[PDB]
């Protein structure tokens, strides 16, 4: 019996300060070796009902600290049907996506929780959580 597996790997030496759009902060993976037509990944931190791939994270030390990121990857499309997250149509057992800075930002020193959930086309195997640390 095959299970859908997820992993999430975060970069490591991030400096608080000016951050450019496109800077990769984390990479995610989804795995499912059963029969499927694609993968869907979304997050509860999605910014607004009209931005399926854009997330807004709040700081642990100060919730007023925000960082805005987007889900990205070759082949991933915004899920316009559900309006939540990104969709990739593939029979491949493995898929991967990036979480990147969305818009030039002044990121303060704090820690942010990055959560995402994945579906093969949620239990404790379909979701993952990491902390993103920006230091001064």
Author numbering: 30 to 150, 164 to 178
Structure paper excerpt:
Saf pili are often found in clinical isolates of Salmonella enterica. In the DSE step of Saf pili assembly, the N-terminal extension (Nte) of an incoming SafA replaces the chaperone G1 strand (in SafB) via a zip-in-zip-out mechanism, giving rise to a remarkable polymer of SafD-(SafA)n (n > 100).
In order to obtain soluble SafD, we engineered a self-complemented SafD-dsc, in which the N-terminal extension of SafA (i.e. the G strand) is fused with the C-terminus of SafD via an artificial DNKQ linker. The final model was refined to 2.2 Å resolution using program PHENIX.REFINE. In SafD-dsc, a conserved Leu4 in SafANte was used to mimic Phe3, and the corresponding hydrophobic pocket is termed the P** pocket. MD simulation of in PapD-PapGII complex suggested a regulatory role of LoopA-B. Based on these observations, it is reasonable to speculate that the Try13 sidechain of SafD might act as a molecular ‘switch’, regulating the access of incoming Nte peptide.
